[PDB]
Amino acid sequence: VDVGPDSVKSACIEVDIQQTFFDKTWPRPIDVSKADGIIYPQGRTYSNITITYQGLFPYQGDHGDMYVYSAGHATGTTPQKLFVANYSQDVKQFANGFVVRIGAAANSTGTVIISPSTSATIRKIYPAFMLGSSVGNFSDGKMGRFFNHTLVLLPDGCGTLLRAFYCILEPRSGNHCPAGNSYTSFATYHTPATDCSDGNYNRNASLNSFKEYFNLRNCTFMYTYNITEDEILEWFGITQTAQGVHLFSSRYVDLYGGNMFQFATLPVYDTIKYYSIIPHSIRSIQSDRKAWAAFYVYKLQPLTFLLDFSVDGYIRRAIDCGFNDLSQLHCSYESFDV
Amino acid sequence: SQLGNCVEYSLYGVSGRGVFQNCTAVGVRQQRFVYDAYQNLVGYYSDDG
Amino acid sequence: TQEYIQTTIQKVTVDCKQYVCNGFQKCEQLLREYGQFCSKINQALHGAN
Hints:
This is part of a larger assembly, with three copies of chain A. By secondary structure, chain A is mostly beta strands. Chain A has three helices and 28 strands. In chain A, the strands form eight sheets. A six-stranded antiparallel beta sheet of chain A has the order 4-26-10-20-21-22, with no helix packed on it. A six-stranded antiparallel beta sheet of chain A has the order 9-23-13-16-17-19. The termini of chain A are far apart. Chains in contact: A-B, A-C. It is classed as viral protein. The entry lists the keywords MERS-CoV, spike, DPP4, viral protein.
């Protein structure tokens, strides 16, 4: 698949990694009683019943891994260096997949990470992921390099589309790029000043920044999904079976409720073993920095849950039957009230 | 065309015998097949709407 | 005349899931296809106790 032209820049934008600024404690563990993180049973629905169900669920009380994106460095009206967390090097085992809590803090007053004394209203931002079968290091020894075909889930268009592609990422050799000099971390970015016009959003802004660090080769697919903009908390999930990689989301079926339904299957058949968060930095001017909501990643495992299906079929309440002894009791009677 | 009758059915691979009735929707529409607490099929969203 | 009248029996509960499968996940996976077997064992003994 033709995924557009290669970047023609001789250098990448310099990336400043300062993890201290991203070491925040904003815990939002899975609350199963509020049905957080639940992927709806896939081939069917139920109405007005309480039953146990076996499937891939996050654990009750799991804090997950918090990630937060920030504004880059600036001087007045001229954005400079990107500002990121050490995320690209933090490679996790995929296991059975994961769910992501996105935009939970939206509408709250938060912090601009790059400037701790500066407050701003928190806005939802979508996570970017890099997933694959094999990992290792880059030319200078830093980790986070993926080999062969890598699945990249890269939101773009200032949060209006999700772009999913499976391709070989060939590190570019220019300045601050992964096969070049003075490399730290790759990162994606968009520049609101030119990319997020009220009308014409740049649907390739994040793709184009990704392309500055890597050449995309042998892409087997590139798919896009549309996202209507809002500030609503949503869940995203990813799993993998013999049929491919399954992408789940709450926004196309249960927007306000949060249950996740499958929206896509990707033809990715090698086993995903590793994943990482692609750090993203927004090249805002100094005078227009926003607070971006943190997202939380929680791992899935084959658990039995007690699921309370409402008349309209949504799961609003659940019990993690292995959480504690009290939970085991509720599950054995298949009821929330014993 | 056969509401109220006992019919054999095969709905997207799901089969058995039963009687269909026109009624108020419950469950998630997108999931097509509505099951009860004993895992019987108890409702269905048809492609005719 | 001596007489003994039994009024109780020893009360016993069983961790049915452990009894049957000993912590093995493959077994537990197959055990699930027998329905809520262990719930029945536990409830019957709970009532008996």
